Amino acid sequence: DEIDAMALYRAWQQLDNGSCAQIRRVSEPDELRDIPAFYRLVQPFGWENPRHQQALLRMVFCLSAGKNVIRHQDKKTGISLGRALANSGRINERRIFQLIRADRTADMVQLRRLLTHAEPVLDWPLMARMLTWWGKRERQQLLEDFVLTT
Template sequence: MERTHDFMGLYQAWERLAPGPRAELRRVERPDDLLEVPAFYRLFSGRGTTEWEKGAYQRLIFCLPCIKHSGENISLGRALAKGRGVGEKRLFQVVRSSEPNDMIQLRRILRMAEPTVNWDLAARQLWYWNDRSKRDLLEDYFLNHSN
C-alpha cells in the first residue's frame, strides 16, 4: 500500500512561517544549505522517515519559496511555458544536469518565473524527481508553449 503524503499540509506550514524564517529559506543556494537553516526543520519535522523521503522533502522545501499555489489544474511545465522569460535552453540545462545541479538550475528558473501552479501537482513531480519527471517537465513545457 502506497503511503500518501500531505503536500498541501507542507505548503500550509510554509504559509504559516513568519517572514524571517521564510527569508532564510529563500536565501539558500543549494539543497544541502537547508540543513543549516532552522526553518527547514520546522517544515520538515516528522515528515520523512527513510533517507529517500528525507531527500524528497528537501527538494520540495528547496523549491517551495519560489512557487505560489493555485487551486486550478496548472502543472509546473505549463506555468513555466506561460511564465515570463523562461526559455527552452534553461529547461534543457535542468534536464541535462545531475543532482544537485538540476535542482539548483530549476530553482533559478522558479525564482525568475515565480510560477503559480497547483502545488499538489508540482510537489508530486518534485517528490518523484528523476530523469522521467525531468522529461515530463520538458514535454509539458513544450505542449503549453506558444511561439
C-alpha cells in the first residue's frame, strides 16, 4: 500500500552506470516518463498504480541529483529534510522561502538544486513520506524546521 522508500533507495544505489546516467540528465520530473530505465526502476514499487505515480516521480527526481547527494541516516522521528538542509550550513534562508513558495514542477527543480548544494544527511523514508503528500502543510513545516535548526 505504501512505497518501500528504503528498497527504492537501495535500488537507485546499485543501479548500473548507464541506467543511472539516463535518469540523471532529466531536467524536470515529467521527463522521467520518456526514460525506459525509469520505468524499470519504479515498476516493483507500484508505478502501474496511478495512486503512486506522482510520488514516485518526486522521489526519483530528488534521487536523480546523484547517487551520493542524499545520504540516508537511521533514526536515533529522524532528521527531516528541513533540518538536514540547515545542518549543512550552506543554504541561505531566502532560498528555502523560494522553495516552499514555488508552484508545481518548479518546486521539484528548485529542491533538487538545493539537494545538490546541501548534500544532506537525513531520514530518507521520512523525506519520501513528505514527498508523497507535498501539501501546503509539508512545505511550511520544511521552512519552519530549517529555521528552528539555525
